[PDB]
Amino acid sequence: QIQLQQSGPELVKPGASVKISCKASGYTFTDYYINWMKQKPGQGLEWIGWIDPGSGNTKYNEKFKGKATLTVDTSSSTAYMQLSSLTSEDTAVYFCAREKTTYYYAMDYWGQGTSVTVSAAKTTPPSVYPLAPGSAAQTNSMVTLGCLVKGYFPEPVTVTWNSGSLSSGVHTFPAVLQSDLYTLSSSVTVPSSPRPSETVTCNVAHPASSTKVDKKIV
């Protein structure tokens, strides 16, 4: 039951700062180092710095020093990392890994990472548009429909097909950034028998704007 739980989704704008967390459990927090890794959307993985929780002695990456400030909290078993003077080059996932310094030198466990998003300060509710074919023969059994969610910020979006009933055939695509907004689309393969005489309404949810939009496919 040894685990590390990080803070979660971060709400930041350029120039500001943010404090990432990483609580450790199931073991003595002070007799194990704590590294901090950064990961761009798909560029790779890199070391930022570690911190001895027995004595706040820290060691940073010369390339992240002067922006990263690791500070522990022996009040219980927590760890933090501050990122100051944020630029869009900081929008990424940050992991916090334990370490068996002495014998193995092996980074045992890891946190779930924290997605830090630093944008041009936008925030917009999506526009959901129903996707239905232009024709369809009865012989053409499996009918495919869709839901186009365009013009939103920030991630993520909760896309469902009926209310959670339609599980199989659901293909919810990865949102690709437009100019200053996100856009995704999902589709479902339904038999040619149900659709014509049965409703299909995708449930779109945007927590960031707190809006729920149901759109029937016709």
Binding site: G44, L45, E46, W47, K59, N61, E62, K63, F95, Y104, Y105, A106, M107, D108, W110, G111, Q112, G113, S127, Y129, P130, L131, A132, P133, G134, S135, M142, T144, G146, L148, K150, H171, F173, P174, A175, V176, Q178, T183, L184, S185, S187, T189
Partner: protein
């Protein structure tokens, strides 16, 4: 900085087969202590990386008997005996010798299987989207393998190269297929001027390109 390099970004293998992932360092991770400071991790994929092998030839705890690290100097090699579904992911080789610590690019493990044809589909702009002044034509190419495919958007026989946004899903856990969603966007001013919009797809499972189309004045 010590440059960590991993030759191939991706390497496909069928379940049961043996995989060999290579890693290459910039200097030499030897010590004299007799140990080579090399580390292998496994991001998988929306999950967190897990230590597989430490100090080059040491199977971490919990790690199965089938994984194996080997090499010397600058040539390092991870090896999976029997490839199982769980093993899918990006494998990372990282050094823990000099400062700062560097991580290799990342070699992904993809699953092989029989070739399947893309169930392409094309959808006209929604009535609601049009009233907003914009027009988007969506083309879905469902389940297919291999991953390679090419979508050429045609508007009245002319190839549209500016205004298209692709989106490929990750490899499905169940059927081991790949999905994609090609979306073209216009101004509902340029959309009304045209008749036909074609979504062409060049895949291995077709002697000729899969063509899906629709014409405006067509009910």
């Amino acid at each position: 900085d010590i440059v960590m390099t991993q030759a191939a970004p991706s390497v496909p293998v069928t379940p049961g087969e043996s995989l060999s992932i290579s890693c290459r360092s910039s200097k030499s991770l030897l010590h004299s202590n007799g140990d080579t400071f090399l580390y292998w991790f496994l991001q998988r994929p929306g999950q967190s990386p897990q230590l597989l092998i430490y100090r080059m030839s040491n199977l971490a705890s919990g790690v199965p008997d089938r994984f194996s690290g080997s090499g010397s100097g600058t040539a390092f090699t991870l090896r999976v005996s029997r490839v199982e579904a769980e093993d899918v992911g990006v494998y990372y080789c990282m050094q823990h010798l000099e400062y700062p610590f560097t991580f290799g690019a990342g070699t992904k493990l993809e699953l092989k299987r029989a070739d399947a044809a893309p169930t392409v589909s094309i959808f006209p702009p929604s009535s609601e989207q049009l009233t907003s002044g914009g027009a988007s034509v969506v083309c879905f190419l469902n389940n297919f393998y291999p991953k390679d495919i090419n979508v050429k958007w045609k508007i009245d026989g002319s190839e549209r190269q500016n205004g298209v946004l692709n989106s490929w899903t990750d490899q499905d856990s169940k059927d081991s297929t790949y999905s994609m969603s090609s979306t073209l966007t216009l101004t509902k001013d340029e959309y009304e001027r045209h008749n036909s919009y074609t979504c062409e797809a060049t895949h291995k499972t077709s002697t000729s390109p899969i063509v899906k189309s629709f014409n405006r004045n067509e009910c």
